[model samples]
Target: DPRLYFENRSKFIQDQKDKGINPYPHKFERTISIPEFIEKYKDLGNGEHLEDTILNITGRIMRVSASGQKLRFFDLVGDGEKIQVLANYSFHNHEKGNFAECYDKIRRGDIVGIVGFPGKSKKGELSIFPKETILLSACLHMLPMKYGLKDTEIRYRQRYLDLLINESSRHTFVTRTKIINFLRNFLNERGFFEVETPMMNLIAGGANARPFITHHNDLDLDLYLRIATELPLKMLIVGGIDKVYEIGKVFRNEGIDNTHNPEFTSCEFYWAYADYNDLIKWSEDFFSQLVYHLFGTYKISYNKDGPENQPIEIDFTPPYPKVSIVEEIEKVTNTILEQPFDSNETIEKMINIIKEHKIELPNPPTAAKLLDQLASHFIENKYNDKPFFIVEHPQIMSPLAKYHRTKPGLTERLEMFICGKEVLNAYTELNDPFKQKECFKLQQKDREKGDTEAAQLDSAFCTSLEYGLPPTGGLGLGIDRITMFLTNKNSIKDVILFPTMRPA
Candidate 1:
């Protein structure tokens, strides 16, 4: 059945060629956008027409309908905006078959250009009366008739088709751009200069994530995709740039889930002479500004039927409550973890205590992994209705953060969570070379102990640290995760234009 459909379209294409018409044209100069045209002429009274003035517009035909005789209407879309075009042969002084033949050939998904005057129909609808129409590009294949572009699998595989059919999908990406621009501006206005770092590196030293490995020919060595921009951005700080930020893509060799993606965009910024406490206030202000700039309100609704089969409202007001990670774990598990588990015995004791409480731990459960899983299950899940910062993580959990001054066995770090997913991780950076080396040694021990998520030891980075990285506060925010929350999307794939998909 689809074969005949293809043949018919092929015939039409050849016929257009026979008529000396190009189905695909390089350019179509438009006088105004569809939205601009509608906004300027929408106030016209019913049945009024602007015959003396003409405007040119170009758009893809979203729909087409034909009435009795030679009257036709086309719904054209351009730049996420749409407008209607009405073609009446008698009113426009066209012979019967002259306009009918051209209009009859038009189909949905065709990109066409029109020169028309403004007019309103008897039904009180504002539309354009086209004096001339030119086909710019032809759509050969038939659009999917059954799907609403909502199928999770199809949407990711055929993202262009999704954008063509779903207005919400198109708007999601448009808003994604707006959010990134707002963030760039917010940082720039505050004296943070944006810079770029290498995507391929010798070692993934920054974040504790598995690296996607690749090969370099000239060097005849294996290179790893950067799992995070932290080390390089900090190295820039060592090279005398006071404030720097990078907004770019980071790849991780990981699984896919509602909140996780193999490849994603992240914004990491380093501020010299600042602490995690300063980042707390700065993050709160940035979030408040972002929400107001996007939605014009501090409170926003997200996750319809997500948590309890009902929408959860999140408030982004300043001074979001700060909860201690250790305290939260202790309160939920009803155990006091006041001492550091420096030895293997104490670490095993802590693990057994967690298992006694019937808490699930990640595979090959290191202390940090056990703590993160506990937080996900207990602490983060309880704060879906608002934003909260879980501060003062265990020193082992944060390899790059400085040790807390007064809070023994804890690091000066904070992770912001909304609806059980981490949105931002900020910490006072560790600058002491010897201490940093020790931290790397501990991580190496974990890796040797079969914790695959342990970060790699980059000797070059430690050497950079020896050159003096001043006291710095660093923040890493997942742009994809933030865009998902701001856009009210449940999946990281929803915010991403083209998420990685399995082979068909």
Candidate 2:
């Protein structure tokens, strides 16, 4: 039945051509949007038609009902609102049969332009009485008539239809845009320069992750899609841009999950002459104000359909608690973790802790990866209900951060986590070119040890560092994760308009 129905609709196109009516038109002279039309004519009395005011409106025909062959009512929807459109043969420009055929052909998903007088029906509902109607575009495929999209597989694949039928999905993406704009304005107000760096890299520098490989055929060279935007943004600091941020996509050839996609957006910023402590204050202020700006409060509901499907409200009130990762890991495991040392001691101690705790080793487990495993189990889930930060990481775990001034075996680093997912990472960047090279060399050892995701010795970034990068602080905010949290969506795909999916 569905196939034949589609076939009949397609056949109507030829029928339209035989009558010399263009089934597809390039333009429609629309006077205003549906919402604007309603606002300007809100005071129109029932049965009082504004005959002097002929307005043109454009919207999608969401619902159509026929009073008879000569009369039809269309509920036109656009800009998240709907209004009634009454098309009668007597008020139409063409003959009765032609007008009836045209109105009957106006399917549910067709976008239409109506030239009419603003008035109300006897039932007191705001309505548009059409003088002329034109089909601007046809919808060959049908859309769901209601809010029910029971299959999530279909919902994500046909995102256009889902957005058209589901109000929450529309609201989620709208909030996503607002969140990004708020972040941009927040930084711009503070005199931060926004810049875009290369998305294809000669070296997959930055975060500890695998990169998507790409080829530049003409140059006969292979480049990797950027795993993170950190290195180039930091190079700008060395070039004396002082403060810069980029909100763009960074690709990582990674697995898909509830919170991760292979290519995702992030806002990475670097400020010269700042420390991890200052970055912490800035992030705290930014997010609290962001929540307030979006919801007029410092609180939002998150994970509405998670953990027994009971929603919990998370407050973003500033001055969030900052726990020391090393200190807390030591406390939970009842062992001394700190040792005055370098990467060698850190690796040995990490292996010892993993053995003691009976933690599973990640593939090709190295010093940094092993420490991350411990943090994942112990620190990440500590404050699962609210926004918080884990600070003062072990040196092996944070390669780009400067050595802590007082702590002998740790770095000045911090990661902000909410609901057990990391949202922001910050560090007091290491400026000493000597130490930077040493860190890269240490990572080379990890790479040799079979950690495929180990940070590479990017000589180019190191050479730029030798040009004297100022003492700076850098931060990366995961845009998708933040959007998911603010929109109270269970998965990152709910906020992303077109999330990557396997072929159906």
Candidate 3:
């Protein structure tokens, strides 16, 4: 039956061609949206019509019905609202069979432009009585009609159709845009210059992640897609830009999961003469503004779905609790960390603790990766319903952060976590050229030791550090994760319009 229906639709397309009517038209000058038309005409009583007013409206046909001899009705939907349109053969002043021909060819999902007057039917349903109808676009393929799109993977793959049918999906993306706009305005108000750095670079020197390799035929060079905007943004700080920020896509050659994608968006900002302490204050203030802007309260709740899902309530009030990373790890693992970070004794002790707990580590588990795994189990997961910062990271974990003034072997770094997911990573940037080179050398040692996620030693970045990067603070915020929290969506795909999916 479906195949026969499709064949009939194809015949209708050919018939339109024979009659010289273009199935797809160039443009339609719409005077009003469906919502506006309904709101302006909803007061009409049953069987009442406003013949003097003619409104041009455009929308996609969502439902079609026919009754009497030459009467047809279509439910037109556009801009997240719906209105009814009534097309009668008596209203047409042209050829006799034209109305019937066009009405017979009409199908759901076809975009149409209508010139109509406001009215109400005998059932008191607000409707549009059209004098003329024009086809703006044709939908040859059949849309899902019975239960609508339900498969999550298929919906993600066909996000266009999902947005057309699913109101919640569309709302999530609209909120995502509004949140991004609020971030831009918030930074712009504070004198931060929005700028863009190169997305493809000769070396992937920013973050400790594998880059997506790309080739340039003309230059005959293999370039790397940027993993982070850190190095270049800091280079701008060395070039006398006091404050700069970039909101763009960064690609990581990584596996897909609930909260990660190979390509995602982030906002990275660099502020000269600021430290991680100052960054904490700014972060709290920014969240306060964001909460007030979006939800109008300092307290917010993300009501997740599922039987095991517990609603997470995060208070965005300023001065969130900060836990020392070393102390938290020591407290949770019940181990004393008296040795230096790079000392073999410390590595052995941590590895023993991890082995005791049966926590699995990633392949080629470098010391940094081991420490991150321990933190994930012992520190970050403890605060699943709250927002907090794990501060003063070990030197082995933060290569680009300044050494702590008082702490013996830790750096002035902090990561903000909400609902057990890291949303922001910030640091008081390392400015000493010698120290920077030493950190890069240490990273290179890890690379040689078969840690593929280690940061590459870029001599050019070291040279730039020689030109004097200011004592600065830098921050990277995961926009997708933030969107997920705000929208109360379970997966990153719900927030991302078109998430990457496996090939069919």
Q: What TM-score does model 3 achieve against the real structure? A: 0.95
lDDT of 3 by residue, 1-504 (tens): 668877887887788889887877888788888888878887888999888888888999989899975889998899888888888777764553477766776789998888878898888878888888888887777777535686547678888888888888789999899989999998899899999999998888778898899899999999999999999999999998889999999999987888898899999999999998899998898877887898988888876453267676878887777989888888877889775665778878877888889988557767788788888888886665558899999888898899999988899998999877899999999999999888888988889878877888877788899988879999999999999888887789889988888788
Clashing pairs in 3: none
Reference-based TM-score of each model: 0.95, 0.95, 0.95
Clashing pairs in 2: none
lDDT of 2 by residue, 158-231 (tens): 88888778777789889999999999999999999999899987899898898888899999999989989899
The reply for model 3, stretches above 4 Å from the true place, is 43-47, 94-98, 304-310
In terms of lDDT, model 2 sits at: 0.85
Off by over 4 Å in 2: 94-97, 304-308, 338-359
The residue pairs in collision within model 1 are none
Worst 10 residues of 1 by lDDT: 89-98
- 1 versus 3: better lDDT goes to: 1
Q: What tens digits encode model 1's per-residue C-alpha lDDT throughout 154-208?
A: 7888888888888788888988999999999988998998999999988987989
Worst 10 residues of 3 by lDDT: 303-312
